[PDB]
């Protein structure tokens, strides 16, 4: 009745429990320490990508009151960001379906 | 018991069901560019070819302008390949791909600037290091960089006189190739536009037949495709001009884009040098760093000369492609070098005197000794064509090198007995349940534990032995097989998935501490963090920052094992 | 051969056979054995290309016979079988004429994916730890 098909080298107490561990864990050697070079590599990764976030190529956007306050009147702005159309590009490097978003 | 709510919270089983290729690309584009760009790139991964209409239809963003602006941004980032398929009976439209190598810049960025900094001849002075670092960051970030803008932005005449001098060096080396249709068009579409025109201009009643006209059409296509791919892969036509009463300069109106194949060759040679550093002592290993440094600049292809991606290789006489590849490697003398030529680049700090023992000073008879010993070494690093001058082969070096890497990765993940068993299956084709004991002589329980552990992957393929008209593996024995190609498939996807997970976790950490990271990346906060930040929040920020430093180190360390598997 | 005994494969005994075969390999093919690597990487030496630096089947047969460490003889087929069993685990490199050499034995005994005893895993309650079986 499917409970006598037990091979000889298999103990009888270690069956039935099942319940494989939550995540199989084997410590890889790719979790080593840090050096001057590794610290500098992390710092240069920090500068990069952050640079493009602070640049125009974001395309990820989806206190909003009805009146501009007197405090908002004659006030410093957030930032005059350089827009997607602002920076000059190469026209002959895009399909003709995208040129219209340029301020040619 | 771990709760199903406790699971899926720290276990991360929802991501385990993603295809690893999509996961990594999506996470890179998300953490670097943004969210809408991530959605677009993921949809591109799902559907290889589509139009802007189909993106509008398939993503929540229907705003035709919004998808367009994200697409021009992604195209700049070299993440998109496009084309125009000509509808004849109405309006002809376009289709956009996803360019895999356009995101490897976003993946290799740290290694990219590391190669750009380190590989140069002059690095003692500090200012040049910072200058080239900022220029390479600006180029890899913005994309197609224009000297017309760059010189205009530069403010000092004495400083404009050297940035123009660095562009020629990168163009000639191979880190700056003129950008054109070849980086923004798919290989199969190139070949299918170069493969039917030859079938349109042929006359009729030609005394040949379908097989003959097809073979000559394929020959003509291969010739023109090889020519037009050679033309922009490396040339002087960007800087071949020379202005009057001035210096040699690249053209001021054109754009410059930084390549990645040259950096991939640099990384591969770095892996070879590290292999030598583990295996061969540094006395004669310091030569190999420069021995490959001076040949990589004109080194041949690593996986595909791009004719093996847009079309089928062959069925009968299918040896032709590797035949011609090894034939070209043999014929081209640029890769062959003599003991005299190697002398003018070796630094003095390498003595080249005590690197030999003839029994139990920058001299050619000693550097040629290392040349010959590398050729005669068990791993065919170089092959001997002529007595005195040899060459490094890639016809029979990549398979054995990749198999060594695969074997040692499995051995690092598993035990020495697992390595012994995988090596038995490798060096003995068609092992069986008794040939294992014949060729191993290790205790059966341990060997079969390692066997069961290694079965789960694509390393070892197992054959069902049919004994009666019904096929059953329950009455008869069953022996083993290798089928190594699946094994190479497997190590690509697992590593790609793990890098995807790492990017996913750093994006999670950014999501969890967005306010803190935005505060950190502020002009006044930069450089002044001790007085401003109160001790508790400063401790939280420093701990999360060292965590991300460590995880970037982990990612970079994993960035030395998967690109080598990426080769064919 | 003697690998048949008491119905089992002599777990402690076989490792004694499979560790000595290469022990005189390193002290006979390297110029000065392991003391070359005992001073630093930029001080050891390699042999000339045209010298007979290698070992062979005859040498190993002689060393096994004179050793009397297992008190048993070994036919040339058996010595070939042993050297073939230990070519796995990356312990030797088989070259033409059944000649044998080691590559990194001292380093292994003492990213460079070919050696990972220098790099120790985090062993900390930290996160972002990578695993290899985790995917499956």
mmCIF file of N, CA and C in Angstrom, chain A residues 96-97, chain B residues 51 53 84-95:
data_model
loop_
_atom_site.group_PDB
_atom_site.id
_atom_site.type_symbol
_atom_site.label_atom_id
_atom_site.label_comp_id
_atom_site.label_asym_id
_atom_site.label_seq_id
_atom_site.Cartn_x
_atom_site.Cartn_y
_atom_site.Cartn_z
ATOM 1 N N UNK A 96 12.193 57.690 -38.111
ATOM 2 C CA UNK A 96 11.438 58.890 -38.447
ATOM 3 C C UNK A 96 10.193 59.056 -37.586
ATOM 4 N N UNK A 97 9.789 58.013 -36.858
ATOM 5 C CA UNK A 97 8.610 58.062 -36.002
ATOM 6 C C UNK A 97 8.846 58.805 -34.693
ATOM 7 N N UNK B 51 5.967 47.505 -32.676
ATOM 8 C CA UNK B 51 5.931 48.901 -33.074
ATOM 9 C C UNK B 51 5.487 49.762 -31.896
ATOM 10 N N UNK B 53 2.893 51.570 -31.802
ATOM 11 C CA UNK B 53 1.480 51.268 -31.606
ATOM 12 C C UNK B 53 1.297 50.108 -30.641
ATOM 13 N N UNK B 84 12.932 49.659 -40.354
ATOM 14 C CA UNK B 84 11.740 50.071 -41.091
ATOM 15 C C UNK B 84 11.404 48.987 -42.111
ATOM 16 N N UNK B 85 10.329 48.245 -41.858
ATOM 17 C CA UNK B 85 9.851 47.263 -42.819
ATOM 18 C C UNK B 85 8.816 47.891 -43.743
ATOM 19 N N UNK B 86 9.051 47.768 -45.047
ATOM 20 C CA UNK B 86 8.328 48.541 -46.047
ATOM 21 C C UNK B 86 7.028 47.840 -46.420
ATOM 22 N N UNK B 87 5.916 48.359 -45.917
ATOM 23 C CA UNK B 87 4.597 47.977 -46.400
ATOM 24 C C UNK B 87 4.407 48.604 -47.774
ATOM 25 N N UNK B 88 4.053 47.780 -48.761
ATOM 26 C CA UNK B 88 3.944 48.283 -50.124
ATOM 27 C C UNK B 88 2.527 48.745 -50.433
ATOM 28 N N UNK B 89 1.521 48.131 -49.817
ATOM 29 C CA UNK B 89 0.131 48.386 -50.167
ATOM 30 C C UNK B 89 -0.520 49.462 -49.305
ATOM 31 N N UNK B 90 0.241 50.106 -48.427
ATOM 32 C CA UNK B 90 -0.265 51.161 -47.572
ATOM 33 C C UNK B 90 0.868 51.943 -46.937
ATOM 34 N N UNK B 91 0.718 52.332 -45.672
ATOM 35 C CA UNK B 91 1.781 53.051 -44.979
ATOM 36 C C UNK B 91 2.787 52.061 -44.406
ATOM 37 N N UNK B 92 4.050 52.212 -44.793
ATOM 38 C CA UNK B 92 5.114 51.400 -44.221
ATOM 39 C C UNK B 92 5.483 51.908 -42.834
ATOM 40 N N UNK B 93 5.669 50.973 -41.903
ATOM 41 C CA UNK B 93 5.929 51.271 -40.503
ATOM 42 C C UNK B 93 7.290 50.727 -40.084
ATOM 43 N N UNK B 94 7.537 50.798 -38.777
ATOM 44 C CA UNK B 94 8.805 50.461 -38.150
ATOM 45 C C UNK B 94 8.588 49.457 -37.021
ATOM 46 N N UNK B 95 9.677 48.818 -36.595
ATOM 47 C CA UNK B 95 9.658 47.911 -35.454
ATOM 48 C C UNK B 95 10.915 48.103 -34.621
#
